[PDB]
């Protein structure tokens, strides 16, 4: 149990979504020695400092393009977990060398600072829009993806795993749809924006990406992209939510934007396991030492799919109505 | 036209630069003709092959933002060639492919802007459509970084383009000529990976004239697409060699069953004229442009709503028979 | 003026950022407003409401050279906002400070030059003067490196020029909005850090004005310095809360009582005139300047020999309840 | 006693004025193994290394702007001592990014390298033009001490600490006035220039400062900043002593040049520490590992200044007359 | 016997010409646990991986100017064998900073990534062009010699050895000479290339460099520059050979070509020491640590050699006929 | 001629640095005279013994290629005099020797290049000719470097020569110097490396005036070589101090019996003047250059084909009284 004692914890991008929740189920649920957050905004950092004002607590001003900061920050640091990115997917079309340098260049530099410190397990946030992408964002997060599980390959005086957590949207996540509507509705909720009527996505709470996180560092080898077994909700259905007697108002698909999201793609589903509720996939390369991704350090199980499998938001086998989202908010 | 012109081609001494550079010398009045790339050997080579005035050889690598800023001093178009491009190898060094092929982009760009270089057209794979590989998602990067470019607007436009087409027959490292090594060696068998495998086929001759095309047609911000013709690998297999059996070795790491050249959620962009199509830019520019009409007054029209240009449901079939006359 | 002009503004996403391209927008016939930043969040948010189309948003750091080169293209005047200025956290992440406002401000200049901008304003600090956190120390670095810029001798002639006042009421992670949060939290105490406290207090539109007059004055090489009130952190307080009590969580790291904004030994450099003063470069140039003599033709005289001018010895006072007209 | 002994010494800037003076004296009183020469002359090392020819010398050429030098010339050292600058006043005011790199980028990489080669401890040298600065090369040195105040914070494997001394003008140093109006009295000695007739200075010896670094040595506890208690004169009185019956002129107050100087701020009195000869100023933050500044290695004790205290040279209770100076020349 | 059981060795360089020689050669030989080809080329690299399919292969694709990917090869190695270079004479003239950056920068990064790693013995290859050169590529071999001998000065937590092997033209290089005429004999042979007549140069085959520079690692003690005694021949009867009954053609002396080539200066002869069947220049500086260069870890005892020695290709004591040089092909 | 031109001179406050600027100052109109070195202390004398309107000084390290962009810009002429020249020293730290020689040159290149300076001439050193220390290998790197940067074409052409010659008499931390310390300090015995060495003589206002004929003479690609007399280091220590005896220290690291300037292998590419000789580059430009005839009309021809320019067969010797006279 609770195989996180006495740990020292480091997250890039602490101060998002994501961190600030990660954050706060690490210092609740475990016993994790210290969290360091590392992430580049002073506001942030003093805000989040006032926040949890936690001892355990430690804030480092820094970004993930600048490996020397890294390999500063990782110093004594058992698990890194790297949250930090740029996400906007119309903003990374138009900005696509940031997006480059921060997503890929900075899974570069963390996997490089994690093995001069040898951190024992990292785990890097993917997202659907990583499967087969169209847009530059996961294009990059796809790069991203490929060096933290190749990163398993080297072998140093102390060893260190990487794997990665791949899911879709998350509810009312900083700056995305959700919020956006809700704020809309709260000046005067006179039109809603709607991209397309056709739009679905997954959809994945803030709390249940996190507790997907840390499970994932529980039963993890090292070389994994975990997806979880998520709902799928149309567009239409979620602004109805947000705004039942409100109009909405076609603006038409964003640069670089997909009516449906995959997770696991139809093509490498010879690679994936299924379990009672997540999937593996597989690296698509072998490692000079081989590992069984069929049983996790849990015990836990897993079968190959279907030679056709196709894990896709558009023909999902579970989906949410607006009544089963405002159970969220 | 090229007419005076000069002209610098990154990864010259590849497939796609041999045969672009012998076509620039003998059907263009190009005045220079620069090949940048990082080996000796194949320069050396490719120097006594061409031992022609119009020529002329940079060792660099486009990784050296310096060494290209350097190399494109006057020139005029900047044909970008220069990847590391087998997907298996891609996979198991991922980082080298990374810094290849989009830091490669991004210093090409910077400094055909530093030079004012006129036009520019990169090289892109249909691996970078939906991509699933390392290297078709370094392309997919390549391609996104040369479309934004065209935001720039310095004292000299320059414009830059992508052209997109399939498999090469034939290119240097592939497999066409490895079944060739293995026939003229005697081999009791054929590798397989899968019985399903399905690819575009593009010559290259075919290739390059479509890039010379291109260059005539472009505004600036096109990702380009030849109409070109699908084949099952099991045929293309039966017909280098009919005689020895194929044994099944299995799918490679990061490969396709199928390749995909336009995208499904990409349709919208998409533009159907007679021999080509043009994936519009997902972006605006600070300056509107007409991709509806080419430079060659060339009349494009949307495709349908559920198009989507894949190797397996190709209208286009190239005929096992009809290939040996391309080997 | 800024008619038909390009601005560009470094951590136009901030405090003073969102207010001088509201003014800009709203006073001027600027024909480009960019904005230079790093959170694609606050961009994001800007872009929606500054939904118009004299606006630019560029993702940068200004950490990163290469990335300035290409934003500053075409652009006629430069404000230099971006830094971090949060004292107690540049003392635990000084090398962090320092990269952001000592090599940002060297890479601005740098950029500024190669794109031949016309007139740069930097923004300083009183925290600069006679400095004794890691913050100051960074800016007043940055100020020399600007002052010192005018030195150069290019195609094109660029100017550049700083802008030093006090607190801007409200800012961004500042106390103000920091007390109306407790205030409006239902706080049973506001900590004060020490009852001796004094500051320099400007408002955001006056800062921005300021900045605005400072680009029509400018010769290049000057620190502009507005007259502005002084204000015992005790009467702030108890303006924004006169009921609930205070208590004392001390000095923090890097604290000085008192602010100064022109240092007695600089008083022989400074040159008063009727609304703000200018420091004069301690350096000679080139070419000659007269700062007693503005672009707006306004004159200026020498200060007191013994002349410093300090939060603590104002002869102007904010009123508490004067303040609170401000909020 | 001798607290040095069998350690390995580098000293950056170790051809200058102060690291002459510094390698002599750790030569001549203590049983170093080793003592290393780091700086960028090949014409001042050549003269160093013949005036010395010591077999405990190792002359290392490198620049401090450069990390993998530094990296690479502080591997097997116990001690290093970082004198190297740019420190003319005036010269930073025209050249002031080759003043920050030297300064400052040098002091970001010294420490980088001595925490990489897990130095034991390490002295920077500051100056009282650092207190409350107005001129570029204070500034500089400013942020160089707080880089050096602010290492301590670091924990790897080995434990290292930083210190930092700052004190007055150096009587004679390499480019200073002193020698310069020696330079005029030899010549001609037609008019002595003076700068401002109410110019006030510390003044300490170069000794005096040598053996004031070593005794911080053996009393740190790292993260202090050490000034010593040291004599004021007037510009004046200084040269009148250096040329009796000479007539003087006013040339004017230099670029970025103050009437007096500071060694500690009024307004970080609350920070400093009174010891018999020496003072102690706290750094502003607080480390992770508290340590108690009253008490030296050394058993002294220390007690905290007025809240009003200000250590200024124009109000020093001890000073020089044209008499004393001459008694060190 | 046998010095190099269960050991990782990495060869920079590897799909070149001694590169594949020196790798059949350790893989037939010996009982290295591991072989790392390290290159950039991807083309050559995947035809290599299926020529030889040995498990005990390995291929990293990277260039020797990036210090970073070398650091990461490197990792686990306990031998490195340096042969990646720009070699062609007249295309480094055209191209002097590509030279530069390969040779000498490739030769600096490859020392650090060796001393970080803890490598325990290095060997580069030079060339009879670095004695007295004449042209930029002998200039950039001169500078990586003298760099991998002064690497021996450093004293790490682990020690690492640097020696140089220096040999003349190898038979049937990769772009040589040898493999050209072949082809123009093969293809019409209607008239042969000649630089000069008086064109001579010392010869080596593959098989003799790869031995020799396995033997070298056997009898290193580190800073030496092996020279192997070999044969010398004249360009015409090298043409004569290759192609009996064709005329030849005066082409004239390409850019930064010598006449004849050194392989020991004259100027270095006192540094210089002979043994059966090779000689050793000794390092022309004094390392901390001495060494005795007379008595190889082989045992085998070298004498000085005479006052005025020059080890010159016009001289040679030892030459090959026409019918010597078909011997070897 | 200088009439008017801005001259920039890297290591402007070495032995060959201070001489050169009082020639220019005092034969010619340069308008301006840029020292372009590290040191604050030389530069803080020179400026002192040069107090001269018509200098500039500029604190930077040729290794910094953003330092020499900024220094560069407006300059006409550049003289590269910076180097690490200590023979002994740059055996024992290479690296350093080749990033300040062979990076430094580069830098210079690149930025005398982007600059569009007209001329640049690098000092060379007899040591760079069939080199067998480091030294002279870095000096031979950077005579390729800047005969090779001729071949760039851009809106401005910049030339680029070479001077090469032997020892200055008495250069900053030479051994004239080091003798006559030894004399003035009452030494008993003098320090002789090796009885047979012998050297090529040049002083420092011969250097400077060849340097300044070279810039008059140049197309670029040069390689200036004067005719200076060679002389026997006994014969030296015999004149400097005929009284006290010599000791014989060994040859130190690195160092040749005899100097070459102009090797044998090299002939075929020499011209000889009446009081020089040219070694023609072995590349050829993309524009060719006939340096039979220098821009002063002077005619060269070709010398033996088994010619070579070495101190110890020279046909000039320096008289050990004669060299008293220069001292
Ligand atoms: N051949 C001769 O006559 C002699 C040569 N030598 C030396 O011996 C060594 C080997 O010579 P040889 O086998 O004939 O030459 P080859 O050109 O056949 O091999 C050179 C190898 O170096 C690699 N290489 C080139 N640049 C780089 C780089 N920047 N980073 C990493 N790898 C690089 C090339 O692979 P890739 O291009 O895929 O990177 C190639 O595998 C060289 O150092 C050469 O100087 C000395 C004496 C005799």
């Not at 360091?36 to 001892?55: C, G, H, T, W």
């Not at 990374?92 to 994690?114: D, Q, W």
């Not at 196709?310 to 969220?328: C, G, M, R, T």
Request: hydrophobic content about 40%; overall charge positive; charged content about 25%.
């Amino acid at each position: 149990q609770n195989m996180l004692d006495n740990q020292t914890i480091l997250i890039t991008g602490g101060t998002g979504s994501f961190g600030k929740c990660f954050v706060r189920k690490v210092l609740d649920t475990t016993n994790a020695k210290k969290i360091i957050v590392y992430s580049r905004d002073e506001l942030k950092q003093s805000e989040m400092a006032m926040e949890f004002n936690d001892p355990r607590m430690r804030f480092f001003i820094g970004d993930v393009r600048d490996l020397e900061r890294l390999n500063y920050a990782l110093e004594g640091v058992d698990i890194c977990i790297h949250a930090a990115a740029l996400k906007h997917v119309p903003i990374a079309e138009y900005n696509p060398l940031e997006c480059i340098k921060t997503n890929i260049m900075g899974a570069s530099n963390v996997i490089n600072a994690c093995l001069k410190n040898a951190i024992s397990q990292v785990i890097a946030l993917s997202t659907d829009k990583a499967a087969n992408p169209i847009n530059l964002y996961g294009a990059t997060k796809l790069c991203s993806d490929k060096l933290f599980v190749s990163a398993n390959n080297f072998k140093g005086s102390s060893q260190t795993q990487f794997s990665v957590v791949r899911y879709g949207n998350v509810v009312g996540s900083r700056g995305s749809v959700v919020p956006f509507f809700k704020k809309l509705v709260q000046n005067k909720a006179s039109e809603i924006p709607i991209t397309d009527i056709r739009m679905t996505r997954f959809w994945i709470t803030l709390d249940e990406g996190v507790s997907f996180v840390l499970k994932s560092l529980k039963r993890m080898h090292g070389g994994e992209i975990f997806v979880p077994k998520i709902p799928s909700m149309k567009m239409t259905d979620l602004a109805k939510a947000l705004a039942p007697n409100t109009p909405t108002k076609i603006i038409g698909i964003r640069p670089g934007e997909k009516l449906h999201e995959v997770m696991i793609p139809k093509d490498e589903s010879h690679l994936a396991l299924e379990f009672e509720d997540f999937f593996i996939i597989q690296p698509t390369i072998s490692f000079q030492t081989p590992k069984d991704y069929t049983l996790t350090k849990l015990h836990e199980k897993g079968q190959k799919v279907a030679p056709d499998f196709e894990y896709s938001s558009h023909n999902n086998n579970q989906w949410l109505e607006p009544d089963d989202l405002l159970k969220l908010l």
